[PDB]
Design a protein around this ligand. Structure first.
Ligand SMILES: C[C@@H]1c2nc(C(F)(F)F)nn2CCN1C(=O)C[C@H](N)Cc1cc(F)c(F)cc1F
Ligand SMILES: C[C@@H]1c2nc(C(F)(F)F)nn2CCN1C(=O)C[C@H](N)Cc1cc(F)c(F)cc1F
Ligand SMILES: *[C@@H]1O[C@H](CO)[C@@H](O[C@@H]2O[C@H](CO)[C@@H](O)[C@H](O)[C@H]2NC(C)=O)[C@H](O)[C@H]1NC(C)=O
Ligand SMILES: *[C@@H]1O[C@H](CO)[C@@H](O[C@@H]2O[C@H](CO)[C@@H](O)[C@H](O)[C@H]2NC(C)=O)[C@H](O)[C@H]1NC(C)=O
Ligand SMILES: *[C@@H]1O[C@H](CO)[C@@H](O[C@@H]2O[C@H](CO)[C@@H](O)[C@H](O)[C@H]2NC(C)=O)[C@H](O)[C@H]1NC(C)=O
Ligand SMILES: *[C@@H]1O[C@H](CO)[C@@H](O[C@@H]2O[C@H](CO)[C@@H](O)[C@H](O)[C@H]2NC(C)=O)[C@H](O)[C@H]1NC(C)=O
Ligand SMILES: *[C@@H]1O[C@H](CO)[C@@H](O[C@@H]2O[C@H](CO)[C@@H](O)[C@H](O)[C@H]2NC(C)=O)[C@H](O)[C@H]1NC(C)=O
Ligand SMILES: *[C@@H]1O[C@H](CO)[C@@H](O[C@@H]2O[C@H](CO)[C@@H](O)[C@H](O)[C@H]2NC(C)=O)[C@H](O)[C@H]1NC(C)=O
Ligand SMILES: *[C@@H]1O[C@H](CO)[C@@H](O[C@@H]2O[C@H](CO)[C@@H](O)[C@H](O)[C@H]2NC(C)=O)[C@H](O)[C@H]1NC(C)=O
Ligand SMILES: *[C@@H]1O[C@H](CO)[C@@H](O[C@H]2O[C@H](CO)[C@@H](O)[C@H](O)[C@H]2NC(C)=O)[C@H](O)[C@H]1NC(C)=O
Ligand SMILES: *[C@@H]1O[C@H](CO)[C@@H](O[C@H]2O[C@H](CO)[C@@H](O)[C@H](O)[C@H]2NC(C)=O)[C@H](O)[C@H]1NC(C)=O
Ligand SMILES: *[C@@H]1O[C@H](CO)[C@@H](O)[C@H](O)[C@H]1NC(C)=O
Ligand SMILES: *[C@@H]1O[C@H](CO)[C@@H](O)[C@H](O)[C@H]1NC(C)=O
Ligand SMILES: *[C@@H]1O[C@H](CO)[C@@H](O)[C@H](O)[C@H]1NC(C)=O
Ligand SMILES: *[C@@H]1O[C@H](CO)[C@@H](O)[C@H](O)[C@H]1NC(C)=O
Ligand code: NA
Lengths: 728, 728
């Protein structure tokens, strides 16, 4: 009898997925770390040399967290003293190593506690943010030029995002954008002066006598938002003038009438930048296209070049308006937008014409535009086999839109249905990354003939390991509700028997534009539950889920906590009808949005679920941030949508938790979904006399991802599920 | 078959203890509220009259929290808009009703948000504190005189205590002391300028969008403490034109050399006040005796009237140096102090003589001095039958100390072994309050020949109800450890069978000077556990416990988390060897100090306990307040006691929790034992990979006493204990 995949296997990572993370440094060369040596690979032939020997920084005196080679290959940026902040933000120390001289640079050093640093895209200029101000070094050993003087901790942010712009808009800490050859540096400035603070305790090591109060500018739904300004400085003039002018590009009049956001910055050419702005009511966006005027040194945005993107059924974009991809000359661009049918497709614009031309169409969606050459556009879509949860690379001929080639579809169709891609600098080569339904497979290809060059990593080591393990299987399929297909997946125990009744766990996220049913291979908690505990772990994509058109995605518009919640309940009813599910043993669990949905389902009075686990749930939309919440809910005012805000809380359903077993879990240092949200759930439950299980995680944030806490939470949850299902 | 005492009975107060709370107004009369009417009773005959009808305030408009009748019976102070702060502190609104003209005073009213108010001991003057300043009204309808002008929230406290003085020194919010005829008002001023703040979140009602941060000046062990000054003002020479002059009485030079406390204020006569000061190192205290100088208007404390009280084995006093009881002329006084054997007895002092004379002696302790006449001193002691957990009233003839008469011992020896007493103004009458081992019994007596006048309340209604319930019994006994007896109690199930094996729960407090084994009748959680669940609930008084001399009490000096923890394990080990205890089912629980000891026990590696519950435990002495902690521990500095502070933490024992079941519970708004303490426990257990059970109570303090939270906590603990013991 082969062993099963156990909780320890999962928690100790005994069965390891191999990756192949390369970094393109030119059109035909990439860097790859092998045995802590940095190797440089010729893409065409596969041969390598040592770029930087593992022993180079033995006497550095610090553990190096990451590195970054300048585009011209002359310098390497060494990152150490890494200190995490939020999802993307952190601070660090930096040294620069001169690759030609083979010397560490010791003068005019990047200061300690630096917030962000980046090379120019050409050469070896550096821009960094320190104490909320921007600085530029033209040469690594020379003095910095200060760009901004207004930086103020928790108040003014120059070239870095505040909490909400980092999480909800840019998915980055950085708010700086070099122009393509590095002449200009564009940046955003955020003003949080009147933004209210979330305040919570951080306990730290036990040696800390008094807990620390962490205070973060965080706008909750309907609260005062940060304001934003945009500037461009000419870095080439820095060594010529005492104090180079940052030229402001003001938002259009249509944004200035009320609260708004900067949502996209994309350079088109050396002297043309595009900016997208979004109204606080997130169904109206404007793209300005701005040209440098040589004789005035100003930036002007012609109204003839201004592009409106709006929605009548929901918000604009999946999570924000999509980025443009400009042709080399900067006179036209490609952009994913929702078509007349509500499906997201590639539209082609001339910069000074308002109507675009759709170059793709159909009842499927383009996920992203990956590369653009003079002859071809490359994109990922879920077109293949009508499967919204698959992903493949396509190539469309720019001079003939009827010529569309799927580059990945038929490579290994049994093993590989979910792809991402990595193109070299001028798209001469691409790495394909297959992530499922079989073991991940990494391969290299030449764009000139789309021929496979070689297999990079095929995970044969893991395959060999998994032969001696009773592994679960995955079913991906659909049910039909109101003449619409809704997709689900099931992690099924080994030797699955259709004539037996299995306990079922519903794994839920269900946020807007989410997808929990897909072709990705995962080794996770569900793997253990199916493999060792013989539990079916199911997930379902109902109304509000993504990549299936706006009719489904915008169904929850202004109504979170309704259809996406009901559809999970209905999914569980449908899984019962299938005949291999023990109706007396159906559980539900989720993290984040999934914790909200789980709690809403457990408080619905449906009778379907015996028990459930919510980890770091939202409990009331007014507690969550403005940008995310208002996108789907509008404003919590009597004029707008307050009634539904107040109607969609977990707390109002407290009495119904008498029918279920509930485990509530939250990290105390969660800056994202505040511990407040679960403090309010537990209080409401105490107030109606409902017994439940609770667990706080001291100083853990939204990820509860520290090594010991991760192991602890999954161990705690396993006991709870096993208890609920009467499993020994 | 009759019912048992259930969890619902405990939580819903089905079986109510009747009380008889009287208020002496003279040597011959008392007030007693009956049916919301206030009656006045003649003590000699038992006849009464209505003092104030219930319906007098029918149209008042506010719900009245409490009342306070002026000593002359002319006025009644009406308390409403009560808002709790800490254990003793609150604010309220106040109105004064004139009892003779049957009218609310509407002029010059006491302000809203008043922090403290008190009648003078004679007549009807008022002193109140509002916004941290002291005010005086000579007549209820006249303008107040402002006494102090320095009051400042969280910084300067006039006539009220700060957090630590309220909790640990005075057990009161008031820091005001009227002289016996109301001429003078003495008061303390506290300065918290450099005291660090504990900060924690308060979530409030669901409607509060952002949690509030509560900030309280709170000195943890070793931190900067509040400073204190003491003043006396003449309320007979106040002026509308001139600001009042307060005369400062400075601490003795022996105190001024370093950090110190004011720990007692007691008026001796109309013109003589005593104060006791205590060093931050709490084994040295000094009493000053100060006389008013009529020609100079100053208060002089003659060095010849200083009395030093120190300890070579521990700290001074049980929780602080004891209060003196001055004779009529104030030329001599009686004070409980530790004798040369280390037993607390009454010493007789002359004001200007160094040596006092002990008037009581033996291997038992005086609990308190209760009344004093020229012929007798009346006191409570645990002398009778050599039982440290019994209490009886005695009088001692002041002219012949060999003549000691027990006044309560033989009244009802089977029902009544635990008394407290309330004397009338000149000790002409006394009320005895028996609280166990039988049902509470309240009686009135006259001092002249100790006649038992009448039974006030015998709880015969409860007795009749309890006849149809299967009530548990209590065993009080002792075990021997190193030739010393230590007492324990067991709450035994109904129909106890010493040939059956019962699970056992060890209920623990074990703080210094605590007593958990006594003759008191209680209806609590243990009653339910024994009556319904057939669990023996044991408590044990080991080293560090009170009322048995300093050899026992001071055993844990500088050494908390040692002998008192060991002695609980040893008691349980001994119980586990008794024929009627199931050694496979022994549990431990406690709250506060008992939560600390429970955790230290479960982390001891003893193997004796299967499971345990800690509620709001201390986890590290450096997190608790200075006044309590340093009393027993000294300072957490390398030159003093840091090493033991560091080795007496719960966190260091985390690994030893692997073999026990542990439930950790804490209120998030605990201002006393900060949530921090439990937050650090859970983190330590997570860090070593130990699974446990947790519950936080949102916005609950140290008492977890809100109605809903109280029902929830005991419900949750009941399930935990029953699960642990395999009980259905
Ligand atoms: C993962 C998702 C996302 N997906 C994508 C896509 F489509 F590009 F893949 N872009 N983004 C932008 C970032 N995303 C977010 O949903 C951000 C959001 N703050 C996540 C979140 C939602 C919650 F309801 C919550 F309670 C906690 C959270 F962290
Ligand atoms: C109850 C006790 C006490 N008992 C007495 C006595 F002897 F008069 F009964 N006086 N005092 C003075 C006040 N007392 C205290 O112990 C105060 C103390 N802060 C209580 C306490 C101790 C802890 F270890 C703790 F963790 C939390 C607490 F609230
Ligand atoms: C991979 O091999 C190629 C081709 O052999 C190397 O390119 C050059 O090879 C010729 C001799 O065969 C010489 O001109 C030089 O020795 C090489 N020049 C370069 C580009 O370095 C190439 O070096 C190899 N790539 C790596 C990264 O090792
Ligand atoms: C950030 O925004 C705030 C507005 O909240 C600006 O602060 C105001 O500045 C003016 C000067 O123009 C003052 O007269 C006001 O008193 C300020 N108001 C507040 C609320 O402080 C601030 O100038 C902005 N900062 C930057 C660098 O743009
Ligand atoms: C460089 O130029 C900027 C912009 O002109 C200066 O910033 C101004 O500084 C003055 C006085 O310190 C303030 O009154 C303005 O409000 C600032 N404006 C902005 C946009 O920040 C900056 O101080 C200059 N630096 C130097 C070294 O002269
Ligand atoms: C990168 O692009 C910038 C912007 O076009 C170039 O700067 C211009 O250079 C031209 C010469 O072709 C001059 O006419 C302008 O005066 C420059 N404009 C500005 C705003 O500086 C720059 O030379 C390019 N860099 C490189 C190295 O090619
Ligand atoms: C305490 O509060 C009461 C009630 O607010 C005060 O009496 C008045 O109350 C009404 C509303 O109840 C208000 O319109 C007035 O502002 C209050 N003032 C007066 C003088 O009528 C009362 O004054 C307050 N007491 C103190 C000492 O401020
Ligand atoms: C309360 O005691 C005070 C202090 O002894 C009395 O005040 C004194 O009264 C006598 C009058 O016989 C004067 O000689 C003193 O000058 C007063 N001394 C002070 C300190 O003011 C007061 O008479 C007593 N009050 C009552 C109500 O009995
Ligand atoms: C009160 O207690 C302190 C601390 O135990 C005693 O001061 C001395 O301090 C250190 C320990 O911190 C040691 O060197 C001595 O053991 C302590 N003194 C002795 C016994 O010599 C202090 O003596 C105590 N005071 C009284 C009144 O006994
Ligand atoms: C209790 O009884 C006494 C005596 O029977 C009551 O009578 C005394 O006080 C009354 C006025 O307050 C008058 O009736 C008499 O002055 C006086 N009589 C005596 C006994 O000398 C007394 O009021 C009663 N006490 C109460 C509180 O009602
Ligand atoms: C309360 O105590 C503080 C000291 O903590 C007093 O202010 C003093 O301390 C300051 C340092 O924080 C010094 O700068 C001041 O010079 C010093 N003042 C005096 C009078 O010495 C403060 O006055 C105290 N308040 C009261 C009303 O007693
Ligand atoms: C580089 O150092 C590593 C140590 O981590 C060593 O294992 C490796 O063999 C070294 N590289 C080579 C080419 O030997
Ligand atoms: C960073 O901090 C270290 C330690 O304090 C210091 O020695 C070093 O000089 C700092 N580096 C810079 C660039 O200031
Ligand atoms: C944006 O949303 C609001 C609220 O639903 C609506 O009233 C308005 O018409 C919308 N605007 C557009 C461009 O559809
Ligand atoms: C009393 O003292 C305060 C503050 O010191 C002052 O403002 C007030 O005017 C004084 N009153 C008189 C009458 O002296
Ligand atoms: Na009698």
């Amino acid at each position: 009898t082969r062993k099963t995949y156990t909780l320890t296997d999962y928690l100790k990572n005994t069965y390891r997925l191999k990756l192949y993370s390369l970094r393109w440094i030119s059109d035909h060369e990439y860097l790859y770390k092998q045995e802590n040596n940095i190797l440089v690979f010729n893409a065409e032939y596969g041969n390598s040399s040592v770029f930087l020997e593992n022993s180079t920084f033995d006497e550095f005196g610090h553990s190096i967290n990451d590195y970054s080679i300048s585009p011209d290959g002359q310098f390497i940026l060494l990152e150490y003293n890494y200190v995490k902040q939020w999802r993307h933000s952190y601070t660090a120390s930096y040294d620069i190593y001169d690759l030609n001289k083979r010397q560490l640079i010791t003068e005019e050093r990047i200061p300690n506690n630096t917030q962000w640093v980046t090379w120019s895209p050409v050469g070896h200029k550096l821009a960094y943010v320190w104490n909320n101000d921007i600085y530029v070094k033209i040469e690594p050993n020379l003095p910095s030029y200060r760009i901004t003087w207004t930086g103020k901790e928790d108040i003014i942010y120059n070239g870095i995002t505040d909490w909400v712009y980092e999480e909800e808009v840019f998915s980055a800490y950085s708010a700086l954008w070099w122009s393509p050859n590095g002449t200009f540096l564009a940046y955003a400035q955020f003003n949080d002066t009147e933004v209210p603070l979330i305040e919570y305790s951080f306990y730290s090591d036990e040696s800390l006598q008094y807990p620390k109060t962490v205070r973060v500018p965080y706008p909750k739904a309907g609260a005062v938002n940060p304001t934003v300004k945009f500037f461009v400085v000419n870095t080439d003039s820095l060594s010529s003038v005492t104090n180079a002018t940052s030229i402001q590009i003001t938002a259009p009049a249509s944004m200035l009438i009320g609260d708004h956001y900067l949502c996209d910055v994309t350079w088109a050419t050396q002297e043309r930048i595009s900016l997208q702005w979004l109204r606080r009511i997130q169904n109206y966006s404007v793209m300005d296209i701005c040209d440098y005027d040589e004789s005035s040194g100003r930036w002007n945005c012609l109204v003839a070049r201004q592009h409106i993107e709006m929605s009548t059924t929901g918000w604009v974009g999946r999570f924000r308006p999509s980025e443009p991809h400009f042709t080399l000359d900067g006179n036209s661009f490609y952009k994913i937008i929702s078509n007349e049918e509500g499906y997201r497709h590639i539209c082609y614009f001339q910069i000074d014409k308002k109507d675009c031309t759709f170059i793709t169409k159909g009842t499927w969606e383009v996920i992203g535009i990956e590369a653009l050459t003079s002859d071809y556009l490359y994109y990922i879509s879920n077109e293949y086999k009508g499967m919204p949860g698959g992903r493949n690379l396509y190539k469309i001929q720019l001079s003939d839109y009827t010529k569309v080639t799927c580059l990945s579809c038929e490579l290994n169709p049994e093993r590989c249905q979910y792809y991402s891609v990595s193109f070299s600098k001028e798209a001469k080569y691409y790495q394909l990354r297959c992530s499922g339904p079989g073991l991940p497979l990494y391969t290299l290809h030449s764009s000139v003939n789309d021929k496979g060059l070689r297999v990079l990593e095929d995970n044969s080591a893991l395959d060999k390991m998994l032969q001696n393990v009773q592994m679960p299987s995955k079913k991906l399929d659909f049910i039909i509700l109101n003449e619409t297909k809704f997709w689900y997946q099931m992690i099924l125990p080994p030797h699955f028997d259709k004539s037996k009744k299995y306990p079922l766990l519903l794994d839920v996220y269900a946020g807007p534009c989410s997808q929990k049913a897909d072709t990705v291979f995962r080794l996770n908690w569900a793997t253990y539950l199916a493999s060792t505990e013989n539990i079916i772990v199911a997930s379902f994509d109902g109304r509000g889920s993504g990549y299936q058109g706006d009719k489904i995605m915008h169904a929850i518009n202004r109504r979170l906590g309704t259809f996406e919640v009901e559809d999970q309940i209905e999914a569980a009813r449908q899984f019962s009808k299938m005949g291999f599910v023990d109706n007396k043993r159906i559980a539900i669990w989720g993290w984040s949005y999934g914790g909200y949905v789980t709690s809403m389902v457990l408080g619905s009075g449906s009778g379907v679920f015996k028990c459930g686990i919510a980890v770091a749930p939202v409990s009331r939309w007014e507690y969550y941030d403005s940008v995310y919440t208002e996108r789907y809910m509008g404003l919590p005012t009597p004029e707008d949508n307050l009634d539904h805000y107040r109607n969609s809380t977990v707390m109002s359903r407290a009495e119904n938790f008498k029918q279920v077993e509930y485990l509530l879990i939250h990290g105390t240092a969660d800056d994202n979904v505040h511990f407040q949200q679960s403090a309010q759930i537990s209080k409401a439950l105490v107030d109606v006399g409902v017994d439940f299980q609770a667990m706080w995680y001291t100083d853990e944030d939204h990820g509860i991802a520290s090594s010991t806490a991760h192991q602890h939470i999954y161990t705690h949850m396993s006991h709870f599920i096993k208890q609920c299902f009467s499993l020994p």
